Amino acid sequence: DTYYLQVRGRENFEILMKLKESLELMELVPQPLVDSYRQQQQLLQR
Amino acid sequence: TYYLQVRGRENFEILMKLKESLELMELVPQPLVDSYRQQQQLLQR
Amino acid sequence: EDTYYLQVRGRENFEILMKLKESLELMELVPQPLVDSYRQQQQL
Amino acid sequence: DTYYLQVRGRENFEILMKLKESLELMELVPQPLVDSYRQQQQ
């Protein structure tokens, strides 16, 4: 279920933390918003 | 609103996934972010 | 190989994604023996 | 320094590993190639 990742460099660490945060948080978003968002993307890039 | 370009399909798909997570995150109310961030303080240094 | 674009909402988001595109694209200027050696270690 | 983070979800962990790999490898690129690449972006 849970994984451990090691990184060298503070700047790299902080960067990965921001992405870890966004990735973990989006699981608290109701699926129809997620799906709505992906529908929208289809007009925004190929 | 800003535009970036990237070489490589795999690279493109990776950036779309992160873009999604970064953009969706703003639809998460602030109290759930706080409750999430407080929790992280127990999970890594 | 091919070239794709994307749109991003937010300057913070764009700056984050730019750093990541950079590393993703720069990585291919890395000699393959150095890629293989790094992967050798990481695995252990 | 070395740092660790915990992450929930195998796919989340998988995306993050590739970005970890790319950020570390990229430190190997000689600086002139990095500067050249940046200006080319502009």
Swiss-Prot record, chain D:
Phosphorylation by PLK1 and PLK3 inhibits the transcription regulator activity and pro-apoptotic function. Higher levels of phosphorylation seen in the brain from patients with Huntington disease. Residues 1-34 are annotated as: Oligomerization. Residues 1-28 are annotated as: Interaction with HIPK2. It is found in: Nucleus; Cytoplasm. Induction: Not induced by DNA damage. Isoforms lacking the transactivation domain block gene induction. Belongs to the p53 family. Found in a complex with p53/TP53 and CABLES1. The C-terminal oligomerization domain binds to the ABL1 tyrosine kinase SH3 domain. Interacts with HECW2. Isoform Beta interacts homotypically and with p53/TP53, whereas isoform Alpha does not. Isoform Gamma interacts homotypically and with all p73 isoforms. Isoform Delta interacts with isoform Gamma, isoform Alpha, and homotypically. Isoforms Alpha and Beta interact with HIPK2. Isoform Alpha interacts with RANBP9. Isoform Beta interacts with WWOX. Interacts (via SAM domain) with FBXO45 (via B30.2/SPRY domain). (Microbial infection) Interacts with Epstein-Barr virus protein EBNA6; this interaction inhibits TP73-mediated apoptotic pathway. Possesses an acidic transactivation domain, a central DNA binding domain and a C-terminal oligomerization domain that binds to the ABL1 tyrosine kinase SH3 domain. It is linked to Ciliary dyskinesia, primary, 47, and lissencephaly: A form of primary ciliary dyskinesia, a disorder characterized by abnormalities of motile cilia. Respiratory infections leading to chronic inflammation and bronchiectasis are recurrent, due to defects in the respiratory cilia. CILD47 is an autosomal recessive form characterized by onset soon after birth or in early childhood. Maps to a chromosome region frequently mutated in diverse cell lines of human cancer. Appears not to be frequently mutated in human cancers, in contrast to p53/TP53. Hemizygosity is observed in neuroblastoma and oligodendroglioma. Activated and stabilized by interaction with RANBP9. Participates in the apoptotic response to DNA damage. Isoforms containing the transactivation domain are pro-apoptotic, isoforms lacking the domain are anti-apoptotic and block the function of p53 and transactivating p73 isoforms. May be a tumor suppressor protein. Is an activator of FOXJ1 expression. It is an essential factor for the positive regulation of lung ciliated cell differentiation. This is Tumor protein p73. The gene is TP73. The chain holds residues 353 to 394 of 636 of the full protein.
